[PDB]
Amino acid sequence: VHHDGFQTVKATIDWEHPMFKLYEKAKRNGKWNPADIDFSQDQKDFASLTSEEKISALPLVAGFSAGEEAVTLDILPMAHALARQGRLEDVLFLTTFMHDEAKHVEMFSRWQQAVGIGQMDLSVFHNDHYKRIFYEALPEAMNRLYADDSPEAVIRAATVYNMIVEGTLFESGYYTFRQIYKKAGLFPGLLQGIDYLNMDEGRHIQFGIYTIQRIVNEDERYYELFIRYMDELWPHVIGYVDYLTELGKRQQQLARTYALEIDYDLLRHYVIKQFNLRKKQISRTK
Amino acid sequence: VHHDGFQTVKATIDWEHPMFKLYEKAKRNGKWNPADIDFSQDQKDFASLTSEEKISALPLVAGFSAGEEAVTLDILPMAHALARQGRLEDVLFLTTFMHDEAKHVEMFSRWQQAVGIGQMDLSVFHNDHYKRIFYEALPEAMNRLYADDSPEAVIRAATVYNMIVEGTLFESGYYTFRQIYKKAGLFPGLLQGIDYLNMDEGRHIQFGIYTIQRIVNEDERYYELFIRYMDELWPHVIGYVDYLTELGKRQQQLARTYALEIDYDLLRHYVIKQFNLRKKQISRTK
Ligand SMILES: [Fe+2]
Ligand SMILES: [Fe+2]
Ligand SMILES: [Fe+2]
Ligand SMILES: [Fe+2]
Ligand SMILES: [Mn+2]
Ligand SMILES: [Mn+2]
């Protein structure tokens, strides 16, 4: 449907808008290029691994590649909904969000190619709970926005996308990967990639917090909605975590070899901790 | 609706895809930031102008600010349609397309703020023909893709967006602005902005050419469709050009003052020339 007018012809960008300020930061700090990462050492490292050390790494890489791909694709409806509501600064910021995700998908896919598992189908490490979140709930909640951009639909989208997928699962997965492979001294290029990624994702969660909070601010009721959508997903979050935990426990060599005490009961608590932490960034009134 | 799987878990990005290669170039050459442009001289220049020299510049700025805003918003459905068709490399490239446009809107809006016309409503320089293209035909053709992503709907979208708006009108408008204000020595910051912009837009047109050509390649019939949608818009293109021409002719001082022979009959022929040129980049068979 038509345009009514244009904000930058009638007025200007709102230079003080919190999302314009996040946009300015995204440009300043968003310069990294996955094509510049030297993966030659990751290649040698992965080859040097035994065939069962090799698979120890792959479940997490399978959850991330798919994860980054899904969120690259599934942010588009948010951008549309907010655009149609006239929230131009939000939209400007979301262009950097989307391009960041594109680079995240790119980065993992380059790592897979370079270490020589590009031809390998990693779908086999997505259990039913992973599919529920990434193959199903994430795209259902975002796509809904094309026909329903009610406060309730926008809170639920930002909750599933930003608070659970990015704010709980990805955050914990970055922590985990660094806890394990940084201590072993493995996969320097990938870890460099993860670090850049982790920095981008700091902005992304700030958009979700801003979005959920500005809706909650209109009406307290929406707070209980937020808490509820969080608790609804939790079973699928921990059920993916158990599945991974249980995979990694039946492969103990890399932990033995590189001699790393993978405290699964410490990772598990980080997930639990991230989740509660996200709840605390939304207040019933603010 | 659900995801079936993920290309970067089953396989990798198609590193040889023409849109992945355009994505890589966009990252390398897409580093400019409008926030870094020094507009202090543009401010002094605009103040130094007489009040009727001042308005000589504004119609074109009004067509561009709105123009950049519209295309920032109206590329989203293309990204969605291609995403839903599984064209991941296209989508990656389109993240850079969208962010480029965000910066284009940003750049003009900064120029308006800096020269002190930010509070001025420039909508008054959008005649009926401009509205037909930008307020109406552009968003109708893009949004259609949400419900109809037939070859025919995708060709028409790329034609209106990339071949007419960007490939004909914007291209000509950049040429014009540089023909006039570069020769006068005015508005150095804006021209710097326009130059960066013109470089980004080289990639954008290559996506539209790629998109139209890959559809035409399936079936010659679509070529006549392409030519026809081009010819349908032309009246609105030249009717905006006459309106501008006719504005600039009833303001002759800046042309007198800065002593520039604004050959309107040379600009007019550039528009005609860009248009035919775009037709020639699509072949009935290739
Ligand atoms: Fe993210
Ligand atoms: Fe289960
Ligand atoms: Fe463009
Ligand atoms: Fe007319
Ligand atoms: Mn990401
Ligand atoms: Mn542009």
TrEMBL record, chains A, B:
Molecular-function annotations in GO: metal ion binding; oxidoreductase activity
Positions contributing to Fe(2+) 3 binding: D128, H129
Gene Ontology biological process terms, A to Z: deoxyribonucleotide biosynthetic process
List of residues binding Fe(3+) 4: H129
Binding site for Fe(3+) 2: E101, Y161, E201, H204
Protein name listed in UniProt: R2-like ligand binding oxidase
Residues that hold Mn(2+) 2 according to the record: E101, E166, E201, H204
Entry binding sites for Fe(3+) 1: E68, E101, H104, E201
Protein residues bound to Fe(2+) 2: E101, E166, E201, H204
Gene3D superfamilies: Ribonucleotide Reductase, subunit A (1.10.620.20)
Family designation: Belongs to the ribonucleoside diphosphate reductase small chain family. R2-like ligand binding oxidase subfamily.
Organism the protein comes from: Geobacillus kaustophilus (strain HTA426)
Keyword Oxidoreductase included in the entry's annotation: yes
Residues involved in Mn(2+) 1 binding: E68, E101, H104, E166, E201
Chain residues that bind Fe(2+) 1: E68, E101, H104, E201
Cofactor(s), names only, from the UniProt record: Fe cation; Mn(2+)
SUPFAM superfamilies: Ferritin-like
Top-level taxon of the source organism: Bacteria
Binding site for Fe(3+) 3: E101, E166, E201, H204
UniProt binding sites for Mn(2+) 3: H129
Keyword check for Lyase: no
Keyword list, A-Z: Iron, Manganese, Metal-binding, Oxidoreductase
Chain positions recorded as Fe(2+) 4 binding sites: H129
